[PDB]
Design a binder for this molecule. Structure first.
Ligand SMILES: [Zn+2]
Lengths: 177, 71, 114, 24, 130, 148, 108, 46
RNA sequence: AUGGUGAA
RNA sequence: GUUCUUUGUAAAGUGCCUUCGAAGAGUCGAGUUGUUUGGAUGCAGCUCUAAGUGGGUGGUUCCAUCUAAAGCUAA
RNA sequence: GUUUGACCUCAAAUCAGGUAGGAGUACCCGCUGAAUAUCAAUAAGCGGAGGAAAAGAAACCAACCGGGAUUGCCUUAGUAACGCGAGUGAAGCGGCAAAAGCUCAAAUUUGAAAUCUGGUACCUUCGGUGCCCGAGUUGUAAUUUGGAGAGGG
């Protein structure tokens, strides 16, 4: 498949061809609003491996965030606030420069009957998935939360506040031990 | 200094600031704070008529059925 | 006392309107006096209006019979959260691979004694 | 995989050398 | 709470639900044989022992075949399409039992079925018809 | 002034040879949805031994699958694909595989001949007419590869 | 400060849940057959204990497949390897006994 | 030499099974009387 | 210290 | 249990022989600056930026265990 | 062609079918956050969900004759470790409660975009069918998710 070629080409990020593409695309986006609807992703391989599919129900948005609450987290929060009726699934980096960093976020509309009847995507329609970025359930949010296995995440394996509450509580049984 | 507020009528609508210190009018959110435990109780749900919330529990008990009795 | 709804069910729209007008005239005449009959006529007016509304609603339902996207007024009043929470068909939707796996190896019933 | 190696070589020839690689 | 007091004072009335007794009682709903022999007076473990079945496969924590015969007795309680039959008959008439020759029939073996599949289908057809 | 891997586009097949290639490709237009549907309905009604169909290959993933197998004889590439990275490497892949390639201006024009609004690439594997295809390939080579 | 006044209530709820599972899962024993396991941490290696599920090699040696085994009530764990002949033989014998003792009703 | 693998499937040298499935589905629909053959549609065009 | 109130 | 349907050269599984046999990059990683931990880890602005019999985690020549940079899932 | 078409982009319609605010808030998730070590990832503030939430089937724990999703309890243990000062303070193994595995990216359906949204008329109406419209080729269905898996006999 061609997607392997796309991934390999994207591996050499500092190639003169990708440099030209990035500097052209950033200049083109500089003339557009901060957040706007994207007709199609500029990195089809990344979106496809992130779960995006070219079918009625998916939406691609490009958002610009000031350089220097991670930048990806801020972008996800902004797109979720603007796209209140859509659910943020994942996002990927698409460009950067000395002033701004650009990320592309793919959204799925749970109201569209195509998604509702999609056995592989109807899970997002559950109300528990509302505003995934708000609770940091996205890929970037989970990574920032330190959720992982091993000694490197013992203090933040699942919930930094939960462990503090557990170690601060006084468990007393009916018959004292 | 203050005047009747349309949303609440608490007579706390500042004339000069054009805002209500009690309910937060015209802000969409209703002003409330955790430290104001008594304030929250004074405006907590159930203090009013509850024209619609009252029947929700009864409707749920029947599974939100529709139609009419078969006699 | 008063009018009976079961008698008014079969009345036509024009007859119901005439009865409502007569009841309104009677109520207006009685108001000048200021008297339980006032309560009876008030209840009759409400019953006639309810019968007329019921007839109109069933007519509206009939004109929208079977076709998709009926007026929101006639739609279910269950709750906001139940219009979401995908319906039974959507929830039961399953991919072909999972159906094939289930058919090939369905959950069996068994007991362990011998 | 031979195909993966071929694709990697093709990408290497297409992308040329990176600015830091060009210093060599 | 304020809402509880309002509901108690309201004339709407509580939506009373009495189901405490129903938590203790559970009716078997996955077998007709067990239901006839199951006794709700005994516990799960006691009922399983009475029926002659194991309620636990691993060593249970803490201290501790007249019916199975019915279960064992309970254990003792595809064709070819018309177009497929016609296709099989055509090849059988054209080549008989010559499977190797039948395999190379370009204008009758539209689908390049293997010799094994062809012979199996022909044997099934013969058994069903002749 | 751009990197050599870029600007390989903007040099394209001339008007005459491009028109000849389009005329040749129009012969193998794939059966559109309506035509295929009606033909299948007719076949079902008749039922109620077959020659292999011939059509152009246009799917980018499908074309790339056919490319690098050396089955593709001539491939058309659109020069206005917004994700240019999807087609920057295709000419080099074709050159490495020895498959002649032709850059034709307009993805919309490329897609108009395959019943699609747009089509990034188009390739031919089978032929009805082999002499015409060989002559077109030779002309395209002599006019594009030996020049640019 | 949490006081476990519900201990009796929690036990009653667990018993009720088990009874409900039995009512829904009457024919089956509510448990999946588990393999024998030897623990690490030599302080406990002498103790043998039940595992999560049988290895693929053990299931194959038992004359059945993992997909079919799961539908019959056998826990399958593809993460555990095998490096002891005695444990493998014990697991195979346990699986054979389970297969010889299970009764499966017809799907018809 | 080509880089790929997975030698040619039989379906590439055999008529498509999807076409047969669609034809049989249309035949079933005709049997159920919910599809009119195009020849009958020509007559019904009157 | 946190969050608000009015006051030129 | 009861009743109508299946079908279509349709979809899977078992053992054997044969030909092939993909793997999440501004990502891992190092540097520095703020932050958390009783953990020295992790979190975070930014210069650079990794490989495929490769990469991560642990010790006396390396040996033990997985395949991150996507997501869903009742108890 | 001193023209006429394919798209792509951008606007509008009292367009048709949809969703978003807010309320409540004991529990859940994220951000922020006081009165160099201590009160402290507390108090207060903001944003986002449900009946539970989060997490969840390892780039895991271990150095053993090895265990094998996540979660809660006892134990480990007031130990290791640190600030060695007042003091903070884990985690594997072990026993218990309950156990369920899966879905995409990745190699051609190319002998048939086989996929799906919407409109229309019916029926057995949480949906199905005939037709049309549009999305899809810059990839919608099936086949594979490392336990390997795929074309054939
Ligand atoms: Zn007010």
């Amino acid at each position: 498949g061609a997607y392997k070629y796309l991934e390999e080409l994207q591996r050499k990020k500092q190639s003169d061809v990708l440099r030209f593409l990035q500097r052209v695309r950033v200049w083109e986006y500089r003339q557009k609003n901060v957040i706007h609807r994207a007709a199609r992703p500029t990195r089809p391989d990344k979106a496809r491996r992130l779960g995006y599919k070219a079918k009625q129900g998916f939406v691609i948005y490009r958002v610009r965030v000031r350089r220097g609450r991670s930048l990806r987290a801020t972008a996800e929060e902004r797109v979720g606030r603007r796209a209140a009726n859509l659910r943020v699934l994942n996002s990927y980096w698409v460009n950067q420069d000395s002033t701004y960093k650009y990320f592309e976020v793919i959204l799925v509309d749970p109201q569209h009957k195509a998604i509702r009847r999609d056995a592989r995507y109807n899970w997002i329609c559950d109300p528990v998935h509302k505003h995934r970025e708000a609770r940091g359930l996205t890929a970037t949010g989970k990574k920032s939360r330190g959720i992982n296995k091993g000694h490197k995440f013992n203090n933040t394996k699942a919930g930094r506040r939960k462990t503090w509450k557990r170690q601060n509580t006084l468990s007393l049984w009916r018959y004292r031990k | 200094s203050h005047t009747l507020c349309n949303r609440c009528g608490r007579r706390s609508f500042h004339v000069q600031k054009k805002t209500c210190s009690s309910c937060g009018y015209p802000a969409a959110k209703t002003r409330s704070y955790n430290w104001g435990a008594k304030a929250k109780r004074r405006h907590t749900t159930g203090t009013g008529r509850m024209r619609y919330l009252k029947h929700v529990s009864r409707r749920f008990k029947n599974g939100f059925q529709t139609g009419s009795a078969s006699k | 006392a008063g009018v009976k709804a079961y008698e008014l069910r079969t009345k036509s729209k024009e007859q119901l309107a005439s009865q409502l007008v007569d009841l309104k005239k009677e109520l207006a005449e009685l108001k000048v006096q200021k008297l339980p009959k006032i309560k009876t006529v008030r209840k009759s007016i409400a019953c006639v209006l309810t019968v007329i509304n019921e007839q109109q609603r069933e007519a509206v339902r009939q004109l929208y019979k079977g076709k998709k996207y009926q007026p929101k007024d006639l739609r279910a009043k269950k709750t906001r959260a139940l219009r979401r929470a995908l319906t039974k068909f959507e929830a039961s939707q399953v991919t072909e691979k999972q159906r094939k796996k289930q058919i090939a190896f369905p959950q069996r019933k068994y007991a362990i004694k011998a | 995989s031979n195909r993966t190696k071929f694709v990697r070589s093709l990408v290497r020839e297409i992308a040329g050398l990176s600015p830091y690689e060009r210093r060599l | 709470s304020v809402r509880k007091r309002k509901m108690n004072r309201s004339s709407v009335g509580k939506a009373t639900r009495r189901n405490k007794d129903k938590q203790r009682k559970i009716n078997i709903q996955s077998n007709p044989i067990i239901a006839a022999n199951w006794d709700y007076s005994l516990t799960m473990a006691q009922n399983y022992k009475k029926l002659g079945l194991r309620a636990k496969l691993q060593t249970p924590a803490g201290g501790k075949e007249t019916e199975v015969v019915k279960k064992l007795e309970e254990l003792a309680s595809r064709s070819q399409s018309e177009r497929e039959e016609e296709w099989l008959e055509k090849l059988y008439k054209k080549h008989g039992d010559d499977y190797k020759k039948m395999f190379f029939d370009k204008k009758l073996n539209i689908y390049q079925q293997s010799e094994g599949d062809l012979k199996r289908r022909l044997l099934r057809w013969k058994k069903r018809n002749g | 002034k751009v990197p050599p891997t870029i600007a390989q586009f903007q040099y394209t097949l001339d008007r005459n040879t491009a028109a000849e290639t389009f005329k040749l490709f129009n012969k193998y237009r794939p059966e559109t949805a309506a035509e295929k549907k009606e033909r299948l309905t007719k076949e079902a009604a008749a039922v109620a031994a077959s020659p292999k169909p011939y059509a152009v290959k246009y799917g980018l993933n499908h074309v790339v699958a056919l490319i690098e197998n050396k089955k593709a004889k001539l491939v058309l590439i659109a020069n206005d694909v917004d994700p240019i990275e999807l087609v920057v490497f295709l000419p080099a892949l074709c050159k490495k595989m020895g498959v002649p390639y032709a850059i034709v201006k307009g993805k919309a024009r490329l897609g108009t001949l395959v019943n699609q609004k747009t089509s990034a690439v188009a390739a031919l594997t089978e032929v009805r007419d082999e002499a015409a295809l060989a002559k077109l390939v030779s002309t395209i080579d002599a006019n594009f590869a030996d020049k640019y | 400060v949490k006081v476990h006044f519900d201990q009796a209530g929690k036990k009653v709820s667990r018993r009720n849940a088990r009874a409900t599972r039995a009512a829904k899962i009457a024919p089956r024993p509510l448990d999946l057959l588990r393999p024998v396991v030897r623990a690490p941490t030599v302080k406990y290696n002498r103790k043998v204990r039940a595992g999560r599920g049988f290895t693929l090699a053990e299931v194959k040696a038992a004359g059945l497949t993992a997909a079919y085994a799961r539908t019959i009530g056998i826990a399958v764990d593809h993460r555990r390897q095998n490096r002891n002949q005695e444990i493998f033989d014990a697991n195979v014998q346990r699986l054979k006994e389970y297969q010889s003792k299970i009764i499966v009703f017809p799907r018809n | 030499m080509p880089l790929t693998a997975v030698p040619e499937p039989k379906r590439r040298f055999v008529p498509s099974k999807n076409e047969a499935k669609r034809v049989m589905k249309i035949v079933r629909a005709i049997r159920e009387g919910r599809i009119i053959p195009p020849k009958k549609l020509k007559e019904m065009k009157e």
